[PDB]
Design a protein around this ligand. Structure first.
Ligand SMILES: N[C@@H](CC(=O)O)C(=O)O
Ligand SMILES: N[C@@H](CC(=O)O)C(=O)O
Ligand SMILES: N[C@@H](CC(=O)O)C(=O)O
Ligand SMILES: N[C@@H](CC(=O)O)C(=O)O
Lengths: 306, 311, 306, 311
């Protein structure tokens, strides 16, 4: 009568006991995949998750991945692009310690299972479920350092709200995800090297130079305003792009697109505009574009479709 | 008698400085306006020398005028605004203004923005509130104000503590003032400075490279601001480079790439152990501003922390 | 080579001269339908618009309706439910006077035409286009009394952003609209009478009583919190609902759903929960539900599908 | 020595009053707590007599304690908070708190909310800021605070001017204080009042019925608050009834159903002609609070407007 839901854990908090109400909604199995703080999240853990989900797809009805809040939005988007399973994959975390007063973890997990168990949640991409809300893996980001309500889809809004164990879904992401992407990670053991550099007044070119000297496959710029670059940084990246380094212009600004056709001649320089992808998200999609192409023009079209 | 307001321009026109005043003839309903082109750069190219130049000029010309408007690009306006909020000693209003659409475009926001900046600079009630940013009918404090959207004319917001007042029909209802110490309540005296201490910013994300932090350490930087994940957390490699650096006297401030909320003391990072400073609600580019100035007074991490708790 | 776009005007500001750049994107024809401040918007103007759009659908490629900001979100939702034309219908207005400095009207109109001319805008329901943003008629609302950026889809987010005359659409409303609704207004000359009453501390039952004595077809409650009712008001509405008055619980609270299964036994009283529809929006959908049914249970299902 | 804090409870439990304290045993790390159940209603049933009772009690018991916490339903908390912000004369912190999830539910917000309300009430720095609402780790002022979402634990926000401070690890960094006059700076003295003037609220929308406004006028209401469209505008029929009413001495305040921003003077409505008052940033339920109190001092629309410009 109830769904089989697999909980993949990536850090701390067993739990069918800790949240006995899960037993009313699904049959939960749990697997510890890794045990890290999500500030140490890395390419290895990403590759492992995509493979496990892709491998175990026919063994369960849905997945819930328990993950730290810090880089949750990076992992969600990585999984969003590399997961080929059609069944729900829901990521979830907690803003407050397990043992703290009014800990958010218990109900978050419950709502995460609810979402993973809902047949209406399939084919919507990888999801993040926090604070009573279903959020798509592409647009979701953490907006506050301490607030329980931190997770928001700050450009295009949530897909659905959860009340009394039910979801009214009113949206679904248009950008292609999961089984509509060509990214296939099944045989990779490492990802292309992509770095992020910050722009601000009197910015040093040294961070950008250090990535170029290291032979990085790509560099994402956390630009100022609509993806602009401090002069030093621009000169160094203009050079990296003609030398075999893919360059993506994003923005430190927390909402809105870094657009083509603004102050930067992207085609003269061989640069790609990230659109609404923030820098860490642009990194994800740049690493994956680089397993398929090094051509700035092709990379730009990937940035326009996923 | 209308107040004398000086516009200091730092770039192009938003409605060069002579052209912008003729573009907004309604300004003479509200002030006697005088412009000087101080520099003419896109704010993506803003730098320490423009900051020194501006502060020294406001401080030198304070008695010559009733108020200042600074026209400035949107990209780094929040940085300049805060630098000035900590270094100007003039206690007449200093108001920063820019525009999100070009002066020539339909529904160009610069004209009315400039008008509202002048209103604000002319209001006696604007004094002693620190350095201000006026955008989209709203008066914002130089410390909290940041750009929130790549394109929206309403992008400028004080995202943690809110605006100071709203402007309707040429009048301001002020309801808030910044409690953090500013202007003539800070110890920062830039009158004799020719340069500012070197402070770079490094970003944190999954699988972050330590190369950017190492590059700043090898260049002998006086300070590094971490744009951390979540509540100011750092990826392993970045943590290790910045712990070493702080041990050899680099000042290290933990801020956050997360766009609202404080990087707090007493969370996952043991700051006192490492010699690290928590930025509070200062975002990375803003923490840079304060750390640069802190480093003109002290290299001690505990004193730098107290500076991060008072300004 | 260019779309035919019809501008229907409902108030003040010809305009192909006033915004000469329209000529680059469409061939614009203009018709003054009525000339009111939108604070005086009414059932008559609504019926007229739906009929005109429905009648003139095959004569144009898209519609733009210039309307005041005050009740724009009411008209947009009414048209959203009653328009049977498959072609874009875009509503637009201005926060600042025509003759004021940095007037928003010119570029708003331009972006409204851009949206109406985009083939990607069809089949998305009736839209509102303000401040560089494409907003669905159901969720859109005015959030600030004076801000140019006032129009937001505060529950589910915008459908698309407009940069340099192009729209990246990433969302579309799931709730049924336009030709997927049974509301057909082609032969109606009046709508059912629906009133709105406000809740607050020590609230009078007199507003609610006055609607009941008048024989209103329906009453929408702008409830407190999650759609709750001050005791006086509750008693009067509990009575209206058993007497032939349909009762919809909405909320004065500007975001979120008024849910079923919270503090109010909806089925015991014969009440309907508005969900995310604010009171003025709930009124629109209640007036239209009442042209089809007076049954609280059927009305509730209409509130769950449109 | 820990401060003495009194909890006045107005309804059910959020973690009756004796049960809530045993539910949050950590409170005795931070205060010596005493509870009184003052009433026990859902706040959807809040009313004038509870407001009179609360204010008179805080004012009577001010010397008996170091601070007050009022547990209260979320629905009308923003109303109570403002009534009290205008009538309490005690200059120790008064802090309102509630919960969005039931005490029994998973991840119940009431426990930690109550804890944070006590922290706030015990902080010496909380005094002289007016009446406060503490929800979701945030200290909000009683004038601006409103509920923004039907269900979200983070619903409480000061939507125009922002919060006063944020609470982390039991400490508050205060950065703002309300400039509008409150508490012992208002003239409103409710010590001898047995009731409050009658003020109803009418809603505006397309094709709005005038019946609700007529019903209030026929009942002899002392005041009516319009929940206008846009910048406080009124539908024709509603305008006409309320113009007539103001002409016969009903006070009429224009507010707005729009959830942020001021209902301004000098927009489309000629207030001085009609004898109408602009609410400013007061939302309709909040404008009711101030108008009720204004009507204890004056029935003159110009004096009522000045009251709407100062409090
Ligand atoms: N820094 C922690 C925060 C959390 O547990 O959510 C982590 O990301 O693992
Ligand atoms: N990038 C430009 C944008 C503007 O004009 O505001 C600048 O910051 O100078
Ligand atoms: N009150 C005016 C505002 C505007 O022109 O947008 C109207 O709705 O017609
Ligand atoms: N309607 C309830 C909700 C709550 O417990 O806050 C009340 O206002 O009392």
């Amino acid at each position: 009568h109830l769904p089989n839901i697999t909980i993949l854990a990536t850090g701390g908090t067993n739990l069918v006991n800790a949240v006995p109400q899960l037993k009313d909604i699904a049959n939960v199995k749990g697997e510890q995949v890794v045990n890290i703080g999500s500030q140490d999240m890395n390419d290895n853990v990403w590759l492992t998750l995509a493979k496990k989900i892709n491998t175990d797809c026919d063994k369960t009805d849905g997945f819930v991945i328990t993950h730290g809040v810090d880089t949750m939005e990076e992992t969600a988007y990585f999984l969003d692009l590399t997961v080929k399973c059609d069944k729900p994959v829901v990521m979830v975390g907690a803003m407050r310690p397990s043992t703290s007063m009014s800990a958010d973890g218990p109900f978050n997990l419950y709502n995460a299972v609810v979402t993973a168990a809902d047949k209406a949640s399939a084919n919507r991409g990888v999801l993040v479920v926090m604070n009573d809300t279903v959020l798509d893996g592409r647009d979701v980001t953490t907006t506050n350092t301490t607030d329980v309500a931190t997770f928001k889809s700050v450009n295009y809004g949530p897909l659905g709200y959860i009340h009394n164990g039910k979801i009214d879904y009113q949206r679904t992401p248009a950008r292609k995800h999961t089984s509509d992407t060509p990214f296939d990670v099944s045989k990779l053991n490492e990802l292309p090297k992509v770095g992020i550099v910050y722009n601000y007044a009197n910015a040093s070119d040294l961070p950008a130079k250090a990535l170029v000297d290291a032979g990085y496959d790509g560099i994402v710029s956390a630009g100022v305003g609509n993806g602009n670059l401090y002069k030093s940084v621009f000169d160094t990246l203009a050079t990296a792009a003609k030398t075999g380094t893919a360059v993506v212009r994003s923005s430190r600004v927390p909402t809105g697109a870094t657009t083509q056709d603004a102050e930067v001649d992207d085609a003269k320089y061989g640069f790609v505009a990230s659109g609404t992808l923030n820098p860490q998200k642009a990194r994800v999609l740049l690493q994956l574009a680089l397993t398929q192409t090094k051509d700035p023009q092709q990379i730009q079209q990937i940035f326009n479709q996923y």
